[PDB]
Amino acid sequence: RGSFVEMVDNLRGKSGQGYYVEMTVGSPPQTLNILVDTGSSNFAVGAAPHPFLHRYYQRQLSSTYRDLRKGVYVPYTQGAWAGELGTDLVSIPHGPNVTVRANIAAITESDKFFINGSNWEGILGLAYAEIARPDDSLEPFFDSLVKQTHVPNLFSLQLCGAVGGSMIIGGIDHSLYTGSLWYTPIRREWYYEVIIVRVEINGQDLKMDCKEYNYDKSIVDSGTTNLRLPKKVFEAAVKSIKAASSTEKFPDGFWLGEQLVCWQAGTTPWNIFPVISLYLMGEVTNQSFRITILPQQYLRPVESQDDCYKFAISQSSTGTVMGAVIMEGFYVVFDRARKRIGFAVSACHVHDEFRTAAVEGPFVTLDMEDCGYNI
Numbered sequence: 001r002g003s004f005v006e007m008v009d010n011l012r013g014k015s016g017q018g019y020y021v022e023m024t025v026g027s028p029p030q031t032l033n034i035l036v037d038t039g040s041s042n043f044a045v046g047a048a049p050h051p052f053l054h055r056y057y058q059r060q061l062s063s064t065y066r067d068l069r070k071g072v073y074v075p076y077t078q079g080a081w082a083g084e085l086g087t088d089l090v091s092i093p094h095g096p097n098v099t100v101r102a103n104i105a106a107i108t109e110s111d112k113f114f115i116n117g118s119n120w121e122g123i124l125g126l127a128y129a130e131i132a133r134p135d136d137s138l139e140p141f142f143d144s145l146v147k148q149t150h151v152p153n154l155f156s157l158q159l160c161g162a163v164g165g166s167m168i169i170g171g172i173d174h175s176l177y178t179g180s181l182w183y184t185p186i187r188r189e190w191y192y193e194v195i196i197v198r199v200e201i202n203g204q205d206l207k208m209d210c211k212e213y214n215y216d217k218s219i220v221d222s223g224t225t226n227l228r229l230p231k232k233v234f235e236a237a238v239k240s241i242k243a244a245s246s247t248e249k250f251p252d253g254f255w256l257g258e259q260l261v262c263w264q265a266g267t268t269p270w271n272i273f274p275v276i277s278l279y280l281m282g283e284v285t286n287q288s289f290r291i292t293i294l295p296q297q298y299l300r301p302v303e304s305q306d307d308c309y310k311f312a313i314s315q316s317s318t319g320t321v322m323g324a325v326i327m328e329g330f331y332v333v334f335d336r337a338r339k340r341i342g343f344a345v346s347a348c349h350v351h352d353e354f355r356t357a358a359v360e361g362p363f364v365t366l367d368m369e370d371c372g373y374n375i
C-alpha cells in the first residue's frame with residue numbers, strides 16, 4: 001500500500017548477470033529487457049540478431065521511429081557497441097505512468113557487451129549528458145523524462161542480490177529500507193561522482209591519504225559488478241582483508257578473482273571474512289557517515305551440493321567504482337534535484353543471524369574538500 005507500490009519488484013536478474021527493467025519502445029509496442037546502468041548515459045537497444053539476444057528492436061515496425069541520420073559507438077570498461085541514432089516513444093510499464101520521445105541508439109554490432117544467458121537486450125544509461133556519446137548534446141533518457149513530464153527529478157534503486165529489486169522513479173518507497181537515509185553530495189554531474197573519506201576493514205582504518213581513495217574519481221555504477229579500487233588502494237585493502245581472515249588461507253589467485261573456492265551447500269564460513277566500511281562525505285561541513293558491507297556482498301556466487309564464490313573486489317586504473325557489490329547492501333537514492341545520493345540499509349540485502357550491512361553516522365572528518373581529484 002505505499003503510493004509507489006506498482007514500481008516495487010520491477011527489476012529482475014538472470015543468475016546475477018545484471019539487473020534489468022522492462023521498457024516499451026515504438027508503436028505498436030515492442031517491450032525489451034533493459035539493463036539499469038547508473039555508470040553511463042546512453043539508452044541503447046539490440047536492434048539486429050545476436051546469438052545472446054532472444055528479442056531485439058525492429059525499427060521498421062515502429063511507425064513513430066525517427067532516424068537521426070547519425071552513427072554512434074560506445075566503449076565501456078568491459079565491451080563496446082556500435083549502432084544508429086534515432087528517437088522513438090518509450091514507456092516503462094512498471095515505472096512512471098508517462099510516455100516520452102527519447103533518443104535511442106539501435107545496436108547493430110557489438111563486442112563482448114551482451115552477456116549470454118543474462119536475459120537483457122539493451123542498456124539504460126542513467127548518468128548525465130557530459131559522458132554521453134557522441135557528445136553531451138545527445139539528451140539522456142532521464143533528462144528527457146524530467147523535461148517532458150511532471151516526474152520529479154529523482155530515482156532510487158534497491159538491487160537484491162543472492163535476483164531482483166526495485167527502481168522507484170520519481171520518489172522513494174519506505175518499504176525498501178530500514179533505519180535512516182544518509183546523503184552524500186554528488187560532486188559533479190557526469191558520472192554519479194562521490195567522495196570517499198576513509199576506509200576500514202573490520203573496524204581497522206586503512207590509513208591511506210583520502211586523495212588515494214578518489215584517484216581519479218569515485219562513482220556509483222549499477223552496470224559494473226564489482227567494487228573496483230585504484231591500484232594502491234586495492235593492494236592495501238587485499239593485504240588487510242587477508243590479515244583479517246587469517247584463520248583460513250586461500251590461494252593468491254582467489255584475491256585476484258582468478259580462482260574460485262567452493263563450500264558444501266549451506267556451510268560458507270561468512271564469519272571468517274571481515275566487513276568493509278567506506279566513509280562518505282556528508283551534507284554538513286566536517287560531517288561524514290559510513291556504509292558497511294558483508295562478505296555476502298563482496299563474495300559472489302557462481303551457479304551440485306557446492307556453493308562456489310568469486311572474490312568481487314578488483315583493481316581499476318580509472319578510480320573507485322562502487323558497483324553492485326556496494327549497491328546490493330543498500331537502498332540508494334539518486335536525488336538529482338538536490339545533487340545528492342542517499343544510502344540506507346536495504347530491506348532485501350543478504351546477511352546472516354550474526355551481522356547485517358549498516359549505514360551509520362555522523363562522524364567528524366576534517367579537510368574533506370581536499371580528498372577529491374582535480375582534472
Ligand SMILES: C[C@H](O)c1cn(C[C@H](O)[C@H](Cc2ccccc2)NC(=O)c2cc(C(=O)N[C@H](C)c3ccc(F)cc3)cc(N(C)S(C)(=O)=O)c2)nn1
Nearest residue numbers: 016017018039040076077078079113131223224225226324
Ligand atoms: C561512460 C563510460 O566510458 C563507461 C561507463 N562504464 C561503466 C558501465 O557500467 C559499463 C556498462 C556495461 C553494462 C553491460 C555490459 C558491458 C558494460 N559497465 C562495465 O564496463 C562493466 C560491466 C561489468 C559487468 O559484468 N556488468 C554486468 C552487466 C552486471 C552483472 C551483475 C551486476 F550486479 C551488475 C552488472 C563488469 C565490469 N568490470 C570491469 S568488473 C569485473 O570489475 O565488475 C565492468 N564503463 N565505461
Ligand SMILES: [Cl-]
Nearest residue numbers: 026027028029
Ligand atoms: Cl502503439
Ligand SMILES: [Cl-]
Nearest residue numbers: 077224228321
Ligand atoms: Cl567499470
